[PDB]
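Illustration 12: IGFBP-1 antagonist.
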Amino acid sequence: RAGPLQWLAEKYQG
Ligand SMILES: *CCCCC*
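Figure caption equivalent — predicted structure in token form:
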């Protein structure tokens, strides 16, 4: 995970 943020953004929008 070269940027632990994208997955959180997806998670929030879900
Ligand atoms: C990075 C994913 C953002 C989707 C709303």
